[PDB]
Amino acid sequence: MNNKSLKTVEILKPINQQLELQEHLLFNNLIEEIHDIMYSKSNKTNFTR
Amino acid sequence: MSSDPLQQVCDLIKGDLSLERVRDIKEQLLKEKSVVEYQLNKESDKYYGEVEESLKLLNLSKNSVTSIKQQINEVNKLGNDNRFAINRYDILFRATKLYETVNTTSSIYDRIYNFVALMEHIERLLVAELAEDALETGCPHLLEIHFLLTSARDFQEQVVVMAKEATEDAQRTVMKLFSRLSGIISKFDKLLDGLTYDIVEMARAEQISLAIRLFKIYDLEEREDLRIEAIRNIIKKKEIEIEKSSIKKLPNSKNTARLQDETPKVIEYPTNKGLYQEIMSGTISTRTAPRGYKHFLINGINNSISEMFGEMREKYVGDQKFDVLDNMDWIFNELIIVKEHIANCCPPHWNIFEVYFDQYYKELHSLITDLVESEPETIIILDILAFDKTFQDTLKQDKSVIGDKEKETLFKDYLNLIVVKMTEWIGNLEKAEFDVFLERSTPPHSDSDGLLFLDGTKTCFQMFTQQVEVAAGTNQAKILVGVVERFSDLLTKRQKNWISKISEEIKKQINYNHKYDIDPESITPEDECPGGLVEYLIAVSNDQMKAADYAVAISSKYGKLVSKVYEKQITNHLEGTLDGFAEVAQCSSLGLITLMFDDLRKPYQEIFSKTWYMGSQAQQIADTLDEYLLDIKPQMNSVLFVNFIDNVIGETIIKFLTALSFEHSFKNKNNKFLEAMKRDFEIFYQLFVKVLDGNESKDTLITQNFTVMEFFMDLSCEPIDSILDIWQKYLEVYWDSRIDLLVGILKCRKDVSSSERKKIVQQATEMLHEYRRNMEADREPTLMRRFVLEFEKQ
């Protein structure tokens, strides 16, 4: 809504926003391809079958 | 938003990411919205309640006033109930048979038009009674109001002659018109001979407790009765303008008429379309119309009988010069007594209270003409009419007074009088004083220690203090400033003349000292003038300080009944003059310093030659000028004195540094000049410290000049490698006497050469000007102000 546009704090909030979002796609496909079971465990690699 | 990005700047006045200061900035916004909603809260509430009473009374009068004109539907439609029903009897034979003889007023018009002829011919003397009062007619409520009702019975021939305008016959106002010659104008003018002689009888100094009672009672009875009567005829043209101009000017005629309407729409046709709005029925019903000028048009002759007796009591001369308001305001006292006596007599009319303010038009307009130009006593012009303004105010409600509006222009006449008078006064006082001061064997007003006051300046003191008694006496922002500040321009002409003729006192002691001990080939006519200028010029500075006494001290002493703005407008040009009260001392007392000197110019340039080097020239200068400040010292005003002896040590050191360009080669060779800078330094020390006793200025107003003493000892005694720092330190205090003095010091010296003058004195010249960019950006011009001695080719 508030655009804002620009610094003060927004922008230079949105960097950590969008890169935190690609960080959540990183951890997201990490746990997705963990027990995909493209690595096999109950988890990725902590084997419980 | 266009506010929010600006608010993003206001919160961007916290940093950029400033969450703590963003929180506090939000608390600031909460304070702003907080108070804005407190005032918007209560303001919105007051507006809401205004809408509440607004719609509450639009309600309450829509409904209740719709049931007030519809309560006139209730009670006025109840009026239509008994229209042809009421009074339970033959009302048809009461309004058409018994009221047929109401259209039979013949014999009453014959014996009352005939008796109105004969008996008002008798009432042309009986009801027109006079000669002289005998209670104003006698008894004009019997007499003059008997002529009013006799003129109200002849208002059938005066006012209902304008109602009976071709009613049924031709001789109703023709054969009765000769019955109205002794009938109407022998009753209406009988009430106007009794009314003009009633109010004129009420203009007779008592006037009286029964004469103005009866007479004014007739002049309120027929006055207010005449007012509602001709107000009923003007409301017959306004009730016909309400009525017949709702009929003829409906508009549905629609021509309208030619030519009995527009004009006279709406009057509109007498008996009865133009009459019955002042005639029957009509429970009045004539209208009256007595008496027209009982005091309905004759109360103006009562307040104009004290305002024509008052305006008549001016006697425009003014019988001394301004005695118009004496008898005129006496008729204003008789206007208050006749006014309140007549309101005690008559409530409705006949001079209730307007005689007082009408007599204030008599005293106001009277006092605004007796001194209009300067034809009255110009010195007593505004004091008279202003004294009757405030006093004749205080003699009433404050209000049979004399409003003038010519006060201030007469105060411009007091400006021209007191200012040009004080030009004459001040000029004679000056030239009298200065021609006394050239008689130098006797001083002015006695005291043996030179604190003499003066004589014509005392006439300025006390007598100009008496000149401003009208200034402060009327408290003018145009005289108590203007005579005072234009008088301060006259004081500038004064101190210019103290500069002029006190400079002639200076010349008088200059050539009188030439006659005394200074080579008498100088003698002038007006300068036969021995020692004694001391008491004269200090007597001048003494009444500079006594011009501070009455000018300054009387100035802030009395002027305290305006604001400090106007008081300040006075204060700008009498009390900064304290500096002016030694500014003559800026011109007189420096003359004193040269006239301590002018018996002694033989050692004043034999210094720096060989006679003073081992001799008694220092004895003459230091000891003789020491005694010369051992007789001015008891005799001198203080503000003159500190600046004086200050400028004695200074001017006496530059008369001690006179001969630096005579080019005598310095006797630091065998120390003869050098002892003249050292041993004579002991002799030229008690010229600073026995001159000064009773105070501690002996070196305090001499230290600044021990600078040029000891550094000049470094300048003119000392050799090559000790005149550098002479100009270093002597530059660090006195750059007013510039570097080229050393050139003259090296004009007076062979054994420090000219190339040494190039290095020392020209690199020291660069010290002078580059230090003037460095350290002067040293102190002021002083004793050594413009004694920059002549320089050779560097």
Swiss-Prot record, chain A:
The shown range, given as first to last of full length, is: 195 to 243 of 1065
Described function: Component of the exocyst complex involved in the docking of exocytic vesicles with fusion sites on the plasma membrane.
Q: What is this protein called?
A: Exocyst complex component SEC8
Q: Where in the cell is it found?
A: Cytoplasm; Cell membrane
Q: Which family does it belong to?
A: Belongs to the SEC8 family.
Q: Which gene encodes it?
A: SEC8
Q: How does this chain assemble?
A: The exocyst complex is composed of SEC3, SEC5, SEC6, SEC8, SEC10, SEC15, EXO70 and EXO84.
Swiss-Prot record, chain B:
Cellular component, GO, one term: cellular bud tip
Similarity section: Belongs to the SEC6 family.
Q: How does it assemble?
A: The exocyst complex is composed of SEC3, SEC5, SEC6, SEC8, SEC10, SEC15, EXO70 and EXO84.
The name of this protein is Exocyst complex component SEC6
- Which Pfam families does the record match to this protein? Sec6
Principal place where this protein is found?
Answer: cytoplasm
> Any extra remark in the record?
Present with 1080 molecules/cell in log phase SD medium.
- Which source organism? Saccharomyces cerevisiae (strain ATCC 204508 / S288c) (Baker's yeast)
Please give the residue positions where the record annotates the modification N-acetylserine: 2
**GO BP terms, alphabetized:** exocyst localization; exocytosis; Golgi to plasma membrane transport; negative regulation of SNARE complex assembly; protein transport; vesicle docking involved in exocytosis
- Per the record, the gene is SEC6
